[PDB]
Ligand binder design. Structure first.
Ligand code: HEM
Ligand SMILES: Cc1cc(F)ccc1O
Length: 137
């Protein structure tokens, strides 16, 4: 289930983080409005860019802690508040997060592994709800 999936992702997190983020950028190319340094680069070129690997790992590091602190795929209000109030998230809306979770769920469904894709879909929907409640537009 969901908790085992956090363990699975954490066991190879740099790789899963980059492949999920690439699945997001490739599914939703207009999302690069917020990542202008990633325009005009293939996946292998992005993996070679220091901030692509180091920021994407740090994003998934924190996402796995928010997932781990959740109860039944519902994040802590303190985690939602932190994600709204981060200066690096000043430009964002809940739709940016919805699209990331649609890509993460599609990636899990396409894998041969017994990921609990239904739980990740609920987590993404519950995180969006919590971000809205904490004041993200
Ligand atoms: C649960 C989901 C997310 C978590 C846990 C999270 C966490 C983080 C963290 C920890 C950073 C700091 C990275 C660093 O400076 O090394 C960061 C930066 C940033 N995050 Fe988020 N984030 C999430 C979702 C998103 C989404 C969906 C977007 C946009 C589609 C976004 C846009 C950014 C941007 C633009 C930065 C700064 C630019 C950059 O770091 O390259 N984040 N986030
Ligand atoms: C900055 C960032 C945001 C995400 F949502 C995914 C990967 C990243 O490097």
């Amino acid at each position: 289930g969901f908790k085992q999936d956090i363990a699975t992702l954490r066991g190879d997190l740099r790789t899963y983080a980059q492949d999920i983020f690439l699945a997001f950028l490739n599914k939703y190319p207009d999302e690069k409005r917020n990542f202008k340094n990633y325009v005009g680069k293939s996946d292998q070129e992005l993996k070679s860019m220091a901030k692509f690997g180091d920021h994407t790992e740090k994003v998934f590091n924190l996402m796995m802690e928010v997932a781990d602190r959740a109860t039944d795929c519902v994040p802590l209000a303190s985690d939602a508040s932190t994600l709204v109030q981060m200066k690096q998230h000043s430009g964002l809306t809940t739709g940016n997060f919805e699209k990331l979770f649609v890509a993460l769920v599609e990636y899990m469904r396409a894998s041969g592994q017994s990921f609990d894709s239904q739980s990740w879909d609920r987590f993404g929907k519950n995180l969006v709800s919590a971000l809205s409640s904490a004041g993200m537009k």
